[PDB]
Structure formats: C-alpha cells, structure tokens
Design a protein around this nucleic acid. Structure first.
Lengths: 208, 125, 155, 121, 50
RNA sequence: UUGACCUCAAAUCAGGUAGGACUACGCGCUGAACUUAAGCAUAUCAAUAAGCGCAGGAAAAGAAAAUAACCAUGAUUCCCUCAGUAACGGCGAGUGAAGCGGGAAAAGCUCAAAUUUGAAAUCUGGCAACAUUUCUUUUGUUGUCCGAGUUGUAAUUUCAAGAAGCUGCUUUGAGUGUAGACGAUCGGUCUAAGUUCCUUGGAACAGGACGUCAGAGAGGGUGAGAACCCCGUCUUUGGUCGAUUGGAUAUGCCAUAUAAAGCGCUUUCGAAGAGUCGAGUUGUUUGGGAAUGCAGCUCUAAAUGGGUGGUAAAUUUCAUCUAAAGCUAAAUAUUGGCGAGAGACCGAUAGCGAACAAGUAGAGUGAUCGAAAGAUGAAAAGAACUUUGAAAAGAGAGUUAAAUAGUACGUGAAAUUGCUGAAAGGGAAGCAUUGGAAAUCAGUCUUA
RNA sequence: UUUCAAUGGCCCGUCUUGAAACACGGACCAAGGAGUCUAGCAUCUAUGCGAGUGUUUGGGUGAAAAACCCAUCCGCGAAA
RNA sequence: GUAGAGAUUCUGACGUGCAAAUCGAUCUUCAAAUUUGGGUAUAGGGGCGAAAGACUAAUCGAACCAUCUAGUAGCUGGUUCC
RNA sequence: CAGAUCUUGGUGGAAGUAGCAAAUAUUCAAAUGAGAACUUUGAAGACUGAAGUGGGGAAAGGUUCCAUGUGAACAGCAGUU
RNA sequence: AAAACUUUCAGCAACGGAUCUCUUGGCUCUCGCAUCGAUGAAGAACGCAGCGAAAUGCGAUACGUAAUGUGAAUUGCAGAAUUCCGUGAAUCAUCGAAUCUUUGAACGCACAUUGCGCCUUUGGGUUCUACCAAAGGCAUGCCUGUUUGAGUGUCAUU
C-alpha cells in the first residue's frame, strides 16, 4: 500500500475562478518551482493517486477443507496417470513404471551424488536436465524484486521418514521433497496444471 | 539455497554491502586464487591480495601478462600491476587496473602475519 | 438511494474508522511467538507440569449447567478434606480459590477425588537432596515432564 | 612518532616539558606553512598535532587515576569519577533494596517455598 | 551598517567564506558528484536575511 | 535571669532531587466545527481534530462493596462469541454494551484499625573500619556518636480470616567460598569443486566439447546469462579459544534454632478505612431507559451495618459482595526510535517532499512554504600533434568495439526547425469514391 | 505512395426540443490523468458437502507468514 | 509664497507602463489640531478610527498561517480499446 | 485518453514584430586592442549650479572597498570597461 | 506561365527529452529490542584537514587521542613509509579510557550589548598597596539532616 499521506503532505487550496486557470488546488507562496502548481489530485504531478491502495485488502481467501482434500486427491490421482505427466511436461518417456515406487533405502541417503545416481538408474534424470537447461533470467521488473531466475519443475520425491533423503535431494535443481503426511497442492498441481511426476518411497506409498 | 535468517538474499542489500564496504572489508572482497604450485604447497585455495605479491593475469586483454602488485587500489576494487600500463595520447603511461578475481598469485610476500594466516586457514607453510 | 431489493442498510461507518482498522497479518507471527514462549516456559519449569491442575466445576446457567468444565482453583474445604495444607498446595502447584465454595457433596467429592489422584501420581523432590521429609519422594530418578491432561482430564 | 606506552613510563614533569617542546615545534611548523613550506613539513604538522594529543591524553589518564586512588573507598567521589550509564539507571532502585523483604515475607518463603515436583505417567 | 554587533560580524564572516567556488582538486576525485557550488550567493540577488 | 518545647525562618550549610526533549503505543484534562439528518435547533460527526498535563518498555486494569437466580461461577487483560443484540434515538438520521460460553495467559497479596509494656525490640546521617564490584565508577556489613521516633518506628493480624488460649506431631539460612560438570549468551576464528580446450567478441561470464563439487544449483561481484574466478551459501542450534551468565551438583566454612512456622479441636472473643456512602438538585456523560459514570452545591447516616440484584416508592423476606487505603508479572498495544528479514509493491512526472550536496536551494517581517535535479565507457584511454582563427572553436589526426558514446555525454520519440530531393498551389486546407499519370513493390510462374 | 480530374464532404467534444453556430471547452506535442477498495445486502452462476454446514479465535505440526492436522465452543439452518 | 506636506483639474501622458498607482502641467496647505526619525503600547469577532466600513505588511463588510479537510455539491466540467 | 479554462514539461504562429523616444549633448586626436559611438589620456563643448548630479553620516546592505587578471554568462546596443 | 513563398511526403542535420533497460532509493508487511536529560539532553552557533565551499566526522587533545581487532595502506596531487627477523599502515573496523569550544531545560545578572558583577585559591612580571592572568565557584522549588536564629506561642526555674 502507498503511504497514508503521500500526495497530501503539501498545503494547497483552490485559487477560485477568474484567474484563467483550472479550479484545482495550487501550492501557495513563491520563490520556488513548486509555487502555483496544482496539488491534491490523481491527474496531478506529485499528487495522490486515485483510490490509494490499502493494506486491509483481502489477500488471503478461505477454502473449504473438504474441497482442498478433494483437490489433493484429484492431484494425486492425476500424478498416477502417465499421459497427464507427459502433458504437464515431465520427461518420463523411459520411466520404468508410473506410479514410481522406490525402496526404503533411499530415505537414508546422505549424498547428492547418490541421489543423482538413483535418478539416473530409474531414468528420472532427464527431467532434472530439462530443469537445468531451462534456467533463465526473469522477464520484467521481477528480477529487480528478488525474483532473479526462472526454471521448470522436476520430480517430486515423497518420503515417510527423514533420514537424509531431504538433504541428499534438496540441491538437485527442480527436485522438490515433501513428507507424505503433509502433501501440498502447490506442488502436486503446480500452476494449476495436473499431473506432476512423483517418486514415492515404499513407506510413503504404504501410508497413502 | 540459504537457510540462515541472518543472511540477506536481497539483491539490493547485497549490492549496498559490496559498494559501501569499508577498507577492512574490501581487503577480503579482493581475493585472488593461488596457482597450482602454491595451492598444492600451502593447501590454500585462495588468499587476499597484498602489495609486492607476484601474480599473473588470467583473463582480459592483458591475458598472460606478468608482474608484481605495485598497489592494491581498494577504493576502486582494482589492482595495478607493474609493466601493465596504457599509453595516453600525450605519451604518458597510465597503469591499468585489473580485478582481483581475474589474476592468480604465483609468489606470495611471506610475512609472519601472512604465515599465521596460512596456518590458520587450514594450511601448511 | 434506497431502491433495490434486500435489507435496509445498517453500516456503522460514520466515524473515522480507517484510523482504527485492525489487520491480522501478524497472526502466524503471534502464533509462533506464543509457542516459543510456551516452550521456553516448559524448559524453564521442568520437570513440573507446564499447566497446573484445575478443578472440575459446572457452568452457572440453565444453558450450560449440564456440562463440566475446568475451574480456577480448589476450594479451601476441598483441600482440607483431601488433607493438603493451604500453604503447601500453592507450593506443589495446586491452585487455591478462596472465593468458591462447595454447596453440594457431589462437587466436593468430585474435586477431592481429583486432588487425591494428583497427590498419588505426584513426585515431590526433597528440598535438600537425599533427605526426604514427610511428603517427599525417596526416588526421583524417574521424574519426567508429563501433561496433567494426560494424567487426569475433565470428564 | 611518540609511542603512548613509552609516554606512560615517564613523569608528569617530563610529560609537561615534552608537551611544551611539542607545542613549540608545532608553532614553528605553522610559521613555515604561512611562509611557504614543503610537503614534508606540512606532513609533520599533523604528526606533531597527534603527538600533542597523545601527551595530553597520557597526562589526563595519570591525573584521573591518581584522583581515583585518592577517592577510593570513600562514600562520596567526584561526579566525573562516578558511573554514567543513563540518568534513569542511576535513579533506579539498587538490587539490594529491590530484594528487601519484610519479616512476614521472609518467614513465608522460608517455610513454604516453591517445591520442585513432577507427575507420574 | 558601520555600527555592527559581534554576532553579525561572525554571521557575515561565515557567509562570506561559504560564498566561494570549489577547489579544483575536488573535482578530480573518484566518484565526485560536485561540479560547482550549489550555494553561491550574490550581494544583490539573494539576501542573507539575518 | 537561664533553660525546655512548639512554631517559623536563614545559609554558596552536608547530601540529594525536579524541570527539557521524544510522544507510534499509554493515563488523564479540556474540547470543536465541517459533515449526516436531502432544510434545521435535539441528535450525528464525537466522549473525535486542535490545546494541556504525566509515564513506561509497555502502560492501564487487577485479587470483587463481581456475576448471577444455575447442579451456581470466581482478580485483571486480550481474542472469538454474545451482537448490530437488550437498549438508546425530532423512536427520525443514526447509535449500541454486558453476563454466560470457547481460547491466549495465569500469581498472588500488603496496610489502618490490638499493650513489646518484663524493657523502640525500628530508622536516617556523621565518623572509623572492613568488604564487595558490569565498575578504583557498583553495592554494602559491622562498630560508634548525633539525630528521627511514644502525637507510634519494629515484630504480630488482614476477613480467604485471625488473635487469645489449649496438646502434638511435622517442618526451617535473606547464608558465603571452592571444584568440576551441565546449559545459555553476545564474538574473534576455520570451510567443496574448471578458470581445461574450440568458435564468436573490445572483454567469455555466451555457444560447443571434456570434467568436478553438491548438507553448498540463495544472493552479490568480476570488461555480456559464472554452482566450480572471488565474497559468500550449506554443514551451523557446531568446531575452536576466549568470555559472560543460569539452575543443579560435588564439597568446605559460618550458621546460638532456648527459637520460628504449618496443621488440630475451642460454648470463646474477633478491632475491619466519613463531608465517605447515601439523598436531592444542577451540568456533563452512557446502550443504561422515574440517572450509567463523573463533577459542582445543599443535606449528610449507620452497625448484621452498608453496597449491588438494570421501572419510581413504602414494607417484608432471600441471595450476593465487603466500599470510602495499597502493591502485583504473563497473555495486550506499538504511523516514534534502534536493529533485522522479506515482498504477486513503485521503477526517476512513479515510489517519501527528498534515489543526487533534501527539509536543500529559494520565498515571506513572521507563523510557515518548499522545489528542480539519476545513466559517457570495460577502462578517461577526456582527443598528443599539425593547420586556419585574436579567441571560442573548426578541419586533419589520434583514443575506443563504437565518438551514430566527446562531459551540451546510454537509447534519443513527438511538437517545432534548417537543408536537400519530389510534386502541388488563381480568396483556406484536410477527407471519402473512382480511375489516369508518375514512382515503387510483391506474389505468381519458372516447373512436376 | 504522391498528385490531378469529376462527384460528394461545415468543427470536433458538450449540455440541449434543436449546434456548422454569432452557445461552451479546445494553439501544438510528449508523458500523467477519472466507477477503486473495504463492511454488508439482493438476484443470478460455479464448487464442495448436505439436515447439516463452517479447519484458520486458538492448538498441533511444519526449518516455516505457506502447507498439513485437531479438541471444545460458536455462527447460520433444522419451528413457528 | 520656497523647502516640506498634500492631491483639485487636465477626466493630459502612460494604460502587456519608469511605475501591481507613476509622470507632466495646473492646484491646496506651509509656524501649527504642523511635518517627521527612532523607542514604546494596543492583535482578528480583536485593535484602531476628526467616521471613509477607513486602516490593521500590494490581504479587510472580519487579516494572515497551518490544521480539522480529500469539508459538503439536487449545480458545472471531464470520464481512456474493438 | 483528444478534450476536463485537466497536471507537469517542451515548443510554436504572431515575429525579426511591439519595442529599446523623460532626466539639454556631444565632438576631435592619440594610446590600448584581433576588434572602439561607448575604455583611458588630452583638447573643445555643455550640465548639476551650495534646498547640487558636491562632501558626510543614521537605518538597511555585507566585502559591493583596493590592486591585479579576465574565455564565456550579466551590464534589455557594444565593451579592451 | 519560371523562381521565390506556402503546404505535403522522404532522407539528413537540429530542437527537445519521451521510450526502452537499469536502481547503494522509496513504500508496505513481519520479526527482535528498550537505550535521552542538571554526571548538562534534543536542537542551535562557530570552528577543525597540507591543499575544502557543501555533505560526513569531530571539538582548541577538533575529518580526531587512548584501548582492542585486523594486518600494509591512503590516493585527486603531494607526502612520507613499515623494512619485508612488526608493537604496526589505514578517510579500516570495533570501542569499556578521555577530550568535548559558545550555547540551549541552561543555572551569578543579562543579552539586536564576546555587556555587567561577586566569592575563594594561585601565579605573573624591568612595574609589586597597582595592574593582569589562571583555576574552582555563586539559579529556583522541594526533601532528610546540620548550624545559626525569631516569637507579648506553651511553661518551669525564681
């Protein structure tokens, strides 16, 4: 929101009619450029805008919990359909199976080299390479506002217990790691589009 | 990605810190890598530059040039290297500044404080 | 003016309300602050329970008298029946409500049993380590910070 | 360049006469500056000025430490020798008189302090 | 006027010193945003009002 | 005449303290009008703005002269709910709480009224010792003299009781070292991997090969998009070597418990705040309506008395609380200040008035008012030299990737202007349709 | 594309019964510039559940103002 | 009648002026209720006034400054692409 | 966004136009200079005419004083002043 | 009915500073903290650098001294240097010792007057009963105490 007093900190009053000028308020006094210039208006320079933005706008919108659970269930079901995954953009043309379930030994990984080796074995590293090659600079004023780079989304690794899988996988570009108990729709259907490539650990799949 | 809440990921604040850094901070900002021989001998990846160090230009129009550091021009983030000059129109010679990260140190100016720095930073002298 | 279908408007917005608008953007920040203080208190006062034991009372109205809720503290008469001195109760964490009184033996027996369960499950560390005196645990090695709600809820 | 610790191991009279000599050198250097002086002399002006500051600092430390010793273990000491944290802190109650309790409260806390306790599962 | 007070003498003496052009060596410094004195004053145009 | 005491003065008396600023939030006082009522006077705006006084890191409020009418609840504060409700209103415009319930946080108490009377047991100050330290800066203890004090300082008691008695069990430092352990704390210090080749370029940080690191592929810098050149980032709520604190411990020492206290039953007594409650009236307030609070003035109690039980009054019962004295953390607020982090924000006529030497320059006697203004390039390499001119400059040259970047500097739009080329023009011009003329151009074919 | 010929063509915006008007505003150009936001209410539509419904006052949880989970109240509805 | 103080007439000059009140000529007064400097008091529903609603810093039938205030508007003007 | 006697900025036609006409008035030679109606010197001619266009101060200004130097800008022409 | 002039179009040069890109700035939300002053604050004045007018810093110890950390600059020029067998460069950071002019609540009285005083101690010189200088002081209300008083206030002694 703009400041509550931007455009009104000046003193200015309408000079009236009869002076061959618009009846808008003008700065009084003299000796400076600002003297005699209009004030207090959206159309005016250094004036206030029309309908200043306020912080008590509604930024958060409430959603029924049951509808949220409906959307999570739909997003999980879409992730199990191979055709939607290819549409969504994931390079899964040689993935051994969908849904992809991997052993519990992955939860105990400790190195990103082991995590990348796992991805290459299950042929899921094409999606990571897709993310790396898609990394770009943002278009527009976004990069002036701590939004420097953009890239595509890779696989989502779902685990049941943390033993090092988070730290092993968290540096691979595009890979998002999530606990099964707290699945997020912002990750399950990113951008509103269904069918994200999800790699489940065996314990997570059993707890589904 | 950073996970500390005391470190700034703001492009604005990082650029202000770089360009408002005092002399004692620009000393560490202007660091240069060590050559293969010094790196394998001192077990140090890089050290801050210092006057009278014997360095080699790695990048730029003066790639491959050799010389000693005559003066670390900290306030402009530039290193002035001997024999690395440019000829003005009137015939005078103007030293050309080279960034610290674009050179490599091939011989240090070993003082006791520099020796303590080496052994402190997990190195061997 | 008024020419549309619906209620007659009643918007109490004729004062300068925009000065006193209250937003809730610190709602998670307040929530996190309360927990950290709550966890700080639990670590500071451990091993004793974080929340003191409360009596079970009845709300004062035909609308709510069929329910049982938690009171402020145990009355003097209830403590005397349970055998706890008024001075000792506040030391070992039994709140004392001087204002309340027991008009019915039903409520008195309810809270007396409540205190007796608390006393039976209570471990009191000796003032000087190694010399138990009267009400005092001989073995305090197994002491742990549990929840009074887990031990004894309002039923 | 006068070294401050070497100053510290000298007498007050020696510091005073060195201060007078340093002032005389500073006066002569300023005479050169108005009459046209060289870069070396103009650079010596600042060093002489700092040396005079160091002499005056060392003298002051000795005078104030002597005052502190003289006023040590005395009920009233000079205001500049007292604490100066903030005006509010000085006015505040001391921890001794903040912890003062009546005989009633002492007996109550002596006999019924907050016991350390715990609950079984 | 000829009849002054010492406070006015002091105020005029400072204002006379502040009404001078920039040293040239200032402009040669790196990162210098000063090119001319923004605070010059002529005895006819703008008065001190002291 | 000396003295004593009371009262009142004086001192550059010994030692202290108050003012002023900030004021976003906090406690009061004082106090509008615009405005709404389609006019307007009550109302509303609004118990608001301005004015005034006084605080803190919060303040205020706070352990019931509180609700309720229940199977009763139990200091205060805040949140949700009650509830746009009961009620108040030219019953018009409009305004408008509280009990319960759910939660966040929880912590209780201190005096006055009592004969210590077998002992003013209390306290300030001087002086002299010792001692202690965020600290030679801080904070005290002991001794002793003067003084304050019986017109009352201690112990004792606070209504939840208690005090006097009575027997009979249980309980106890306002301590001071030491040692190590276990935590916390601001802070000095330590940190993985390409600058390997080819092409482009002024510069490789680009494209293409070949690799490496990853608990680090945040972000910034560096001559163009850099995980591997550099600072960093992750490891880290940690290693380290220096510090400050916390609660326990492990001990040593001083501790005169003859004492002090909790509990138990008493045929017992049981002190409880006054020009105050209350009443009338007048203003002002409230949702408070035959008065909700507050204030002025008049009248002014009481002792199972006095408050409150939301329609005046009289009488009678029933509950409830215990006023006119006091303290008290947490949950709560925070357009100020200090320090951090971000952002679906603004991107130099925007965002603060101020991205810059901005509350500046300038204006007014004054109170006040108050601008405009960012960008050469990677690097000044900011144009040596010759030549024309009195000079400013020009033309050569030179620098650069580039001067179509020369400080009157990125890009360089439109208005407007000069030159060149083309065409038109007899008191407007511009425009539409249709074609000629001149200029200009593409499809199409070429092939299958 | 320019220009000529023949034909037609008043200066727009505005309030107005009626404007080319001897009614108003407009010399030109660039950038700025006017139905927004919030507390409600009413129809209509979409979605989830459905005699129910509403997680978000709070608690748990999440290294992270998100997401996820949960108790007791309560609001509206189930009776006028 | 001059210095000084005024300001009648020309309804002269000028009237985007030398000038947000001036210039020329004529004219009134000129030893006092005269003209004036500095010091000093009176301040906005107030001052002050040989009185004209005059004057109170080019502002006077209620000055000026900042606020409440983005006062209000059945009235005027504008209100942006196909 | 085409309008709001819209806001700020830039720019036009009018236009090389109105105008630079109060206070009597200048002229010659030389020097200076790239450059002289305007600078300096000399000669002449006039004016203010002691209630001055003289010599001073008060209030107000503040360095405008003095010497030296001067590419512009300023001195509504010029400039060596 | 040619040129000029007027108008249109195009190229180029002007005028102007729009557009595009950027941004050590602003705005907004969140988090943490409690810290001004008679021991002289906030604010003001005037000064301080080898070469400074402003901004920033500082106070006659004046772009600063001590102390701690880092470890070789600063830079526009001059200038030094620190050897590089360190007590040490620096417009560095940090900061527990000091300095802190004239003011200002502002405190001896004043103040469009570097105006007018008083008290104590000390010092100075070709000059000593003079003159000058230095250091430390002198506000108001109030509180506890001290000392000195006042009173046809209450009384004893007599």
């Amino acid at each position: 929101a703009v400041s509550e007093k931007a455009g009104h900190q000046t003193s200015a009053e309408s000079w009236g009619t009869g002076r061959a000028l618009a009846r808008i308020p003008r700065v009084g006094g003299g000796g400076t450029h600002r003297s005699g210039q209009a004030a207090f208006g959206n159309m005016c320079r250094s004036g206030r805008m029309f309908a200043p933005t306020k912080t008590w706008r509604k930024w958060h919108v409430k959603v029924n919990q049951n509808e949220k659970r409906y959307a999570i269930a739909s997003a999980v079901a879409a992730s199990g359909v191979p055709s939607l995954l290819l549409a969504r953009g994931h390079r899964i043309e040689e993935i051994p199976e969908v849904p992809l379930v991997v052993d519990d030994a992955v939860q105990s990984f400790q190195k990103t080299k082991e995590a990348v080796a796992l991805l290459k074995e299950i042929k899921a590293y094409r999606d990571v390479i897709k993310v790396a090659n898609s990394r770009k600079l943002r278009a527009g004023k976004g990069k002036l506002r701590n939004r420097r780079h953009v890239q595509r989304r890779g696989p989502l690794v779902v685990f049941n217990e943390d033993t090092g899988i988070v730290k092993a996988f968290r540096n691979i570009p595009g890979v998002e790691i999530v606990n099964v108990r707290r699945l997020n729709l912002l990750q399950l259907a990113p951008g509103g589009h269904l069918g994200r490539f999800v790699i489940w650990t065996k314990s997570a799949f059993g707890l589904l | 990605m950073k996970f500390s809440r005391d470190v700034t990921s703001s492009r604005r604040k990082q650029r202000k810190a770089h360009f408002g850094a005092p002399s004692s901070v620009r000393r560490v900002l202007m660091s240069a890598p060590l050559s293969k021989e010094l790196r394998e001998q001192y077990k140090i990846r890089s050290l801050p530059v210092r006057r009278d160090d014997q360095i080699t230009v790695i990048r730029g129009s003066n790639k491959g040039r050799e010389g000693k550091i005559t003066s670390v021009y900290r306030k402009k983030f530039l290193l002035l290297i001997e024999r690395v000059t440019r000829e003005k129109a009137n015939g005078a010679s103007a030293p050309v500044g080279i960034d610290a990260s674009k050179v490599v140190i091939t011989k240090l100016h070993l003082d006791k404080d520099r020796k303590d720095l080496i052994v402190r930073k997990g190195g061997k002298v | 003016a008024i020419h549309v279908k619906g209620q007659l408007p009643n918007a109490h917005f004729h004062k300068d309300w925009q000065r006193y608008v209250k937003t809730w953007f610190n709602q998670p920040g307040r929530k996190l602050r309360r927990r950290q203080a709550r966890q700080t208190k639990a670590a500071k006062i451990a091993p004793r329970p974080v929340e003191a034991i409360r009596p079970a009372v009845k709300p004062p109205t035909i609308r709510y008298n069929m329910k049982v809720r938690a009171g402020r503290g145990f009355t003097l008469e209830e403590l005397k029946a349970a055998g706890v001195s008024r001075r000792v109760a506040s030391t070992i964490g039994i709140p004392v409500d001087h204002r309340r009184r027991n008009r019915s033996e039903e409520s008195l027996q309810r809270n007396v049993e409540r205190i007796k369960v608390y006393l039976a499950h209570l471990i009191v560390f000796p003032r000087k380590a190694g010399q138990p005196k009267k009400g005092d645990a001989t073995d305090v090695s197994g002491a742990e910070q549990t929840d009074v709600a887990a031990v004894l809820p309002i039923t | 360049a006068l070294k401050t610790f070497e100053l510290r191991k000298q007498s007050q009279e020696n510091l005073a006469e060195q201060l007078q000599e340093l002032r005389q050198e500073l006066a002569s250097l300023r005479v050169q500056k108005i009459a046209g002086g060289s870069g070396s002399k103009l650079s010596k002006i600042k060093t002489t000025r700092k040396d005079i500051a160091r002499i005056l600092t060392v003298i002051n430390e000795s005078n104030r430490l002597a005052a502190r010793e003289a006023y040590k273990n005395k009920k009233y000491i000079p205001l500049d020798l007292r604490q100066k944290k903030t005006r509010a802190i000085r006015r505040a109650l001391t921890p001794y008189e903040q912890s003062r309790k009546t005989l009633k409260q002492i007996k109550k806390e002596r006999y019924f302090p907050l016991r350390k306790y715990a609950l079984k599962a | 006027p000829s009849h002054k007070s010492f406070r006015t003498k002091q105020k005029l003496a400072k204002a006379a010193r502040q009404n001078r052009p920039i040293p040239q060596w200032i402009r040669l410094r790196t990162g210098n945003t000063v090119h001319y004195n923004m605070k010059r004053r002529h005895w006819r145009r703008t008065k001190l009002n002291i």
